[PDB]
Amino acid sequence: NGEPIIVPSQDVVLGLYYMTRDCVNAKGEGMVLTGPKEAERLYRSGLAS
Amino acid sequence: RDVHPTHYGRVCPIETPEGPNIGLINSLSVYAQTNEYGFLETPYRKVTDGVVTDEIHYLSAIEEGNYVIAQANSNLDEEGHFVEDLVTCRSKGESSLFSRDQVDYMDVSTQQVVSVGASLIPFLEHDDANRALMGANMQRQAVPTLRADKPLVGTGMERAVAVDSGVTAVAKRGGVVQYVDASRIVIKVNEDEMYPGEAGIDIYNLTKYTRSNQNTCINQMPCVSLGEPVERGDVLADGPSTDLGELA
Amino acid sequence: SVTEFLKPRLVDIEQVSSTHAKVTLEPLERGFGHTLGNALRRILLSSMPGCAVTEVEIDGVLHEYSTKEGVQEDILEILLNLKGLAVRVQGKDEVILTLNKSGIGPVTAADITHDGDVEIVKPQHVICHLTDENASISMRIKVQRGRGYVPASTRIHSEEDERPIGRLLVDACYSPVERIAYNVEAARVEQRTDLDKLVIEMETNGTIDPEEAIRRAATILAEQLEAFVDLRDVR
Amino acid sequence: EFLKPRLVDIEQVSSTHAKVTLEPLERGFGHTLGNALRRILLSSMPGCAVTEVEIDGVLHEYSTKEGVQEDILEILLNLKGLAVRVQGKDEVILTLNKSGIGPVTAADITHDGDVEIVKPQHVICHLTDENASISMRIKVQRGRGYVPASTRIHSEEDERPIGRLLVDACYSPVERIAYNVEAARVEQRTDLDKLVIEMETNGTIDPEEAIRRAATILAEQLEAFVDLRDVEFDPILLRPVDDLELTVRSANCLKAEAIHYIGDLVQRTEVELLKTPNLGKKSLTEIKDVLASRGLSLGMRLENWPPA
Amino acid sequence: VDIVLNPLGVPSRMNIGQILETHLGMAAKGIGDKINAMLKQQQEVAKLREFIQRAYDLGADVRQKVDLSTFSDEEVMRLAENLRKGMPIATPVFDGAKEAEIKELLKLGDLPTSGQIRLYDGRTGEQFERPVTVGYMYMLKLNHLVDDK
Amino acid sequence: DDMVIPEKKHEIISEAEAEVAEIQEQFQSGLVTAGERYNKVIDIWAAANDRVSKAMMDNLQTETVINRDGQEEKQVSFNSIYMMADSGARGSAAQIRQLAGMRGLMAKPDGSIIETPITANFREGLNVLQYFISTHGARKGLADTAL
Amino acid sequence: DYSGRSVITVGPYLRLHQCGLPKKMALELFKPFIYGKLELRGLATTIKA
RNA sequence: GCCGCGA
C-alpha cells in the first residue's frame, strides 16, 4: 500500500504518547523558555513535569 | 472439534492441544468417571422437596438431559434450603431460571467442569479462555529445578496431584519413623495395627538422580527427620518438583 | 586482583565549534558507566557556580504585561533574550549594568556601558530591535553569581512589591551547562566482554570550555569525598 | 564554597543490619552521593566465599553419603551461604570432622589460626546414625564479584583429582542497601541535607570500612576525569634462506634474485620464476622438492613482509 | 525486583488473573515477612500464635476452621518457622478470593491497599512517575532452551 | 484498580431484567410468538450492552477531575489502561469493554446467540456457565485459525 | 548450508541495519572465510593447521 | 512413517 511498514509500536507508542500529553496543573505553568534544551534541563532537574 | 453442551462435567473445555489436534484430544474432568457400558458420567447431589441432600447420583449424558440441574454457585441455608426462590439451572442443553421446587439435581462443586491441568490455574475465571488454554498447556512443559518452591498462591489441588501421581513416597502403614537417610526410610509400625507373627517394619528405598523420558532428572528427598510420628497416607519423600507433598 | 579496578584509558574528545563536545571513555567496569555518567550529569546540571542576569529595569511601565512603548518586540521576548545572555563577573557577587540606545537599529550585547570587570562572551547577542523608529530604549540589568538553576518562583525581598518590580523576576540560569547527555554502550577488553563505554555529549552556553566543565564537576565531586579518602589514602 | 560530608553518628542495629549517616550535605549532592555509593557497594565489594570442597567418600555432587540426611548438592548449597572473615590469607582451608547424632554447623569447624565465623549456628548437614562420621575440607578464597564455577577454567591448569567439588562463588557481602535523605538539624545555616544509608550484609565487612572502600573506589574512578587532556608470523617462515640445503648453482641464483628469506621464495608462482636466468628445470624441481619437504608449496599469498 | 514484565500484554490478552495473582502473592509475602520479622526478635509464642490466628481467620465467611488453641506450642513454633517465607494461601478455581479479601489481606500485612508501590530506578535513582504493581508471581521454566535450539 | 467499574451498570442491568420479565409475561399471555420475543430480548440485551459500554467509556475517558489555578476543571484521564487503549500501543475498545463493561451477547454452537448474555466482566468473576459459554467461541476461533 | 537457526530476542541498542549474532553461531557460518584469512596472514601455512 | 511438541 505504500504505508511505512517500519513504525514504532508497543512501548515506543506508549513512550511518546505519555511524553506528548498535557495536564491542567503541574510543575511549571506559563513559563517562557528560550529553547527545547531548557525544557530537557527542567525535566531532568525535577523542576518541571 | 467444538465444545458440545454435554461436555460439562465429563470433558474439559479448556485443556486441549493447539495447532493440529485442537478438539481431537481432551482431558477428563476432575470428577468424571466411566459408566459400566463405557459412557462418561458426572456426579450430582439429589434435591428432595426444597432441601439439597448429601446423597450423590452419577448421571450420564442421556440421563442428565431430562432433569433440571442446579448450579454450584447457588447459596444455601443452614438446613440446606435455597436462600432464593429463583435459581439458575440447566434443563435441556440450555440455561434458564426456575423456582426452588422445580430443581431436580445440584452441581457438586465449582471444579466439576475443569480438568486437573486447568484446576491449578488460580483466578481462572478472570482469564480469557484461549489464554487459559495456553497456560494449561504450558504448565505441563515446565521442568523441575534444583529446589522445589511452593506456589504462594494456589488452588488446593497441588496436594492431590502430587500424592496421586505416585511421584512421592507415601507411608502405607507408617507408625513412628526409626531411621532417616538420604536414600532410605525405615519406619517402625505402631503396635495398634500389626500382622500377627514375625512383627515387621516398613522400608522405603528412595530413587536418587535418575534419567526421565525427557532427559530430565528424577530425585526424591525425605520430609521426615527422626522419630517423627507418621500416619497412614502421610508423605515421606517428595519427588521432582514437589514440596512437602505439594505440587510445585 | 581485589581492590584493582579497570581505569579508562585513551579517551576521545570530538570537539564541535567551541561549545559542543563529545567525550568518550573506554573501558569501564560493568555498571560504572551509569554511575559516573549519572553523577557527572546531576552535578553539572544541578549545582555549578556561574553568573546569569537576575533583575531588569525598563523605563516606563513596570507591569508584568506592558505595551512596550512600541519596541517591535514584547517585553516577554526581551526577558527571554536577556535570559540567554552570558557574562563573566570578576570579583563581585553582584553587578549592575545599563544599556541605552537611540536611533533605529537592532541592539547587541556589546552595547552595554563598558565595565572593565565584567566580560561579555557574545557581543552580538540580540536583545531587541529598538523602539520601532525614531525613539530610544533604556534597560538597567542586574546580574549576580549563583549556583544551579533558580526559577522565578518568588522575590521574597525588600517590602511589598518594591523588589519584585525592581527585579521583574527574570529567570536565572547560573550553571553554564546548556545541555548534558550521557550514554552507556557495550565495550570489551581482552577476554572480558561485559564492559561499559561512556559517551558524554555536552553543549555549553559559553564562558567555559566543556572539558573545563567536566574537570570542575569531577574536581568538586572528588573533593566531596575527602572526608572518606583522607585517612584511607594510598599516598 | 561547599560543605564536606563528615561520617558521623554511625550506628549498628544487628550483627548484619547497620546505619551510617553523613550529616553535612548541600542541596542536590545527597541523592547523587547516595545512588553512587549504593551502586558501588552493590556492584563490587571485596569478600570471601567458598570456592571448592572435598568430602571423604563423596565422588561427585549428585551422589549420596550413608548416614547423612541431605544430598551432596544440598550440602553444597548450604556451604555456599557460609560467611567467614579472614585476615592476611586468601586460600584458607577449613577442615571439619564430626561424628554423632544431630545437625553439623559451622561451630564444629576446626579452629584455624586467623578465621572468624560470623555465625556458628549455620547448619550445613545432619547426621542420622551414631556410628557414622562426616569429614570434609573447604577452601575459602577472597574475591570481588559473582564468579560461576563453570566459567572458570584457570583452575583446570593443574588437573583436579576426581572428588574436587567446584561451587559457585558470590564474594559479595552486601546483600541489601537503601538510602534516604532528610533535613539537617543545623539551624545557623538556611537548610542542609543529611544522608542515612542502611546496609544489610552477611556480617563479613564493617559498614564504615564498606563506605570508605566505596568512596575510595569512586574517587579513583573519578581521577580519570580530573585531568582530561588528550586533545608473516609462522616460525617456519622468517628463516635464513641458507637452511633448505640447496645446490651451489641455486645459491648464486637466489642471491641474484634478492631472495634472502624463505617466505619470499614461497610467494612465487611456478610460471614466473622460470624467466630467471639459468634457473634449470631439474634445479627448479629440486627447489620445489625441498620446499615440499617443509610443507610450503609454492604459490601462497601473504599480506605483509617485515624486514626482519 | 526480580522479574520485569511488560504491562501491554495484559489488556490485550485479558489475563486479569496475572494482576490478581501478583497482588495476592504480594499480600502473602507481606504476611510471611511480618512472621519472619516477629521470629527475628524471638518474642513470646503467645503473641505469634495470636497473629497467626488473626491471619488465618481473615476472610468473608470462609469454610476454614484452622485453630491454634488446639495446636501444640512446639507445633505452633514449627508452623510459624515453615511459612516464614510467605503464607501459602489457596484460592479454589471458580470460588476464589475477591478483591475485598485481597485488599484486607494487604491491609493486614502493612502493605498498600491498591497493590502498587513507589519504585525507584536502580541506575539513576529517580522515582518513576506512576506507581508500579510489584507482586510475587509463580514463574515456570519451560523445556524450550537455546542449548537445544 | 485501573479497570474502573461504572456504578450505574447494575442499575441498567436490573432494568433489562425487569423488561425481560415483562416480555415473558407477554409470552405468557399468548399474544407474542417465540420469534418475536426472541428477537426483542436479543435487541434489548444489545441495547443494554451498548449503554453500559457507553457509560463505562464516559466514566473512564475524562476520569481526572483536577483543579486549576482557579476552581476545578476536568481533562482526559491518565488511566494506564485507558492510555494503553487510546495511544494505540496495545488493545482496543472492545477489549476495554470485555475488561470493564459487560462481556456481551456471544454464542457459537452453530452461529446462533444465547438469550442470556454474560453480564460479568473479567475484573469480576465469571460463573461456570458463563465460562463454558465463552469456551464455545474460543474453540471456534482457535479451530478456525488453525485450518 | 552456511545456514544457522536460533531463538530471537530483542535488542533495543541495535541500529536499524544491525542484528545481534551469537559468536558461537558465527565462526561456523564463516569458517571458510576464517580459513582464508588465517592462510593469508601467515598464521597457518597449510589448511590442516 | 506414526506419536507428541514450538512459532
UniProtKB/Swiss-Prot annotation, chain A:
The entry's stated outcome for residue 10 to P is:
Resistant to antibiotics salinamide A and B
PTM entry text: Acetylated on several lysine residues in the presence of glucose.
**Which biotechnological use is given in the entry?**
Co-administration of salinamide and rifampicin or salinamide and myxopyronin suppresses the emergence of resistance to both antibiotics.
According to its UniProt entry, what is the function of this protein?
A: DNA-dependent RNA polymerase (RNAP) catalyzes the transcription of DNA into RNA using the four ribonucleoside triphosphates as substrates. Resistance to the antibiotics salinamide A, salinamide B, rifampicin, streptolydigin, CBR703, myxopyronin, and lipiarmycin can result from mutations in this protein.
Subunit structure, interactors included: The RNAP catalytic core consists of 2 alpha, 1 beta, 1 beta' and 1 omega subunit. When a sigma factor is associated with the core the holoenzyme is formed, which can initiate transcription. The rRNA transcription and antitermination complex (rrnTAC) consists of RNAP, NusA, NusB, NusE (rpsJ), NusG, SubB, ribosomal protein S4, DNA and precursor rRNA; S4 is more flexible than other subunits.
Q: Which family does this protein fall into?
A: Belongs to the RNA polymerase beta' chain family.
Name used for this protein in its record? DNA-directed RNA polymerase subunit beta'
Instruction: Please give the organism.
Output: Escherichia coli (strain K12)
Organismal lineage: Bacteria, Pseudomonadati, Pseudomonadota, Gammaproteobacteria, Enterobacterales
In terms of the parent sequence, the fragment covers 495 to 543 of 1407
Curated annotation (Swiss-Prot), chain B:
Effect ascribed to mutating residue 14 to S:
Resistant to antibiotics salinamide A and B
Which region is the signal sequence?
none
Q: How is it modified after translation?
A: Acetylated on several lysine residues in the presence of glucose.
Which biotechnological applications are listed for this entry? Answer: Co-administration of salinamide and rifampicin or salinamide and myxopyronin suppresses the emergence of resistance to both antibiotics.
User: Outcome of altering residue 128 to A/G?
Assistant: Resistant to antibiotics salinamide A and B
What family does the database annotate?
Belongs to the RNA polymerase beta chain family.
Q: How does it assemble?
A: The RNAP catalytic core consists of 2 alpha, 1 beta, 1 beta' and 1 omega subunit. When a sigma factor is associated with the core the holoenzyme is formed, which can initiate transcription. The rRNA transcription and antitermination complex (rrnTAC) consists of RNAP, NusA, NusB, NusE (rpsJ), NusG, SubB, ribosomal protein S4, DNA and precursor rRNA; S4 is more flexible than other subunits. In pull-down experiments interacts with CedA.
Q: What does this protein do?
A: DNA-dependent RNA polymerase (RNAP) catalyzes the transcription of DNA into RNA using the four ribonucleoside triphosphates as substrates. Resistance to the antibiotics salinamide A, salinamide B, rifampicin, streptolydigin, CBR703, myxopyronin, and lipiarmycin can result from mutations in this protein.
Q: Spell out the protein name for this chain.
A: DNA-directed RNA polymerase subunit beta
Organism of origin is: Escherichia coli (strain K12)
Gene that produces this protein: rpoB
Q: Which residues of the full protein are shown?
A: 548 to 795 of 1342
From Swiss-Prot, chain D:
Q: Which GO terms describe its molecular function?
A: DNA binding; DNA-directed RNA polymerase activity; protein dimerization activity
Gene of origin? rpoA
Q: Region Alpha C-terminal domain (alpha-CTD): start and end of each range?
A: 233-308
Similarity annotation: Belongs to the RNA polymerase alpha chain family.
Protein name per Swiss-Prot or TrEMBL: DNA-directed RNA polymerase subunit alpha
Where ADP-ribosylarginine occurs along the chain?
249
Short name of one Pfam family for this protein? Answer: RNA_pol_A_bac
The free-text function statement in the UniProt record for this protein reads: DNA-dependent RNA polymerase (RNAP) catalyzes the transcription of DNA into RNA using the four ribonucleoside triphosphates as substrates. This subunit plays an important role in subunit assembly since its dimerization is the first step in the sequential assembly of subunits to form the holoenzyme.
Q: Where is this region: Alpha N-terminal domain (alpha-NTD)?
A: 1-229
Per the record, what about its domains? The N-terminal domain is essential for RNAP assembly and basal transcription, whereas the C-terminal domain is involved in interaction with transcriptional regulators (such as CRP) and with upstream promoter elements.
Q: How is it modified after translation?
A: Acetylated on Lys-281 and Lys-282 in the presence of glucose. PatZ controls acetylation of Lys-282 but not of Lys-281.
Q: What is its EC number?
A: 2.7.7.6
Q: Which Gene3D superfamilies match?
A: 5' to 3' exonuclease, C-terminal subdomain (1.10.150.20), DNA-directed RNA polymerase, insert domain (2.170.120.12), RNA polymerase, RBP11-like subunit (3.30.1360.10)
For this UniProt record, the keywords arranged alphabetically read as follows: Acetylation, ADP-ribosylation, DNA-directed RNA polymerase, Nucleotidyltransferase, Transcription, Transferase
Judging by the UniProt lineage, the source's domain of life is: Bacteria
Membrane-crossing residue ranges in chain numbering: none
Q: Where is this region: Required for interaction with Crp at class II promoters?
A: 156-159
Query: Residues bearing N6-acetyllysine?
Result: 281-282
Asked whether the UniProt record includes Acetylation among its keywords, one would answer yes
Spell out the reaction equation it catalyses: RNA(n) + a ribonucleoside 5'-triphosphate = RNA(n+1) + diphosphate
Curated annotation (Swiss-Prot), chain F:
Application of this enzyme or protein: Co-administration of salinamide and rifampicin or salinamide and myxopyronin suppresses the emergence of resistance to both antibiotics.
Function, as annotated, reads: DNA-dependent RNA polymerase (RNAP) catalyzes the transcription of DNA into RNA using the four ribonucleoside triphosphates as substrates. Resistance to the antibiotics salinamide A, salinamide B, rifampicin, streptolydigin, CBR703, myxopyronin, and lipiarmycin can result from mutations in this protein.
Q: What is the similarity comment for this entry? A: Belongs to the RNA polymerase beta' chain family.
Coiled-coil spans are none
The protein depicted here goes by the name DNA-directed RNA polymerase subunit beta'
Q: What is the lineage of its organism?
A: Bacteria, Pseudomonadati, Pseudomonadota, Gammaproteobacteria, Enterobacterales
- Tell me, how does this one assemble? The RNAP catalytic core consists of 2 alpha, 1 beta, 1 beta' and 1 omega subunit. When a sigma factor is associated with the core the holoenzyme is formed, which can initiate transcription. The rRNA transcription and antitermination complex (rrnTAC) consists of RNAP, NusA, NusB, NusE (rpsJ), NusG, SubB, ribosomal protein S4, DNA and precursor rRNA; S4 is more flexible than other subunits.
* Record note on modification: Acetylated on several lysine residues in the presence of glucose.
Q: What happens when you mutate residue 134 to A?
A: Resistant to antibiotics salinamide A and B
Q: Signal peptide span per the entry?
A: none
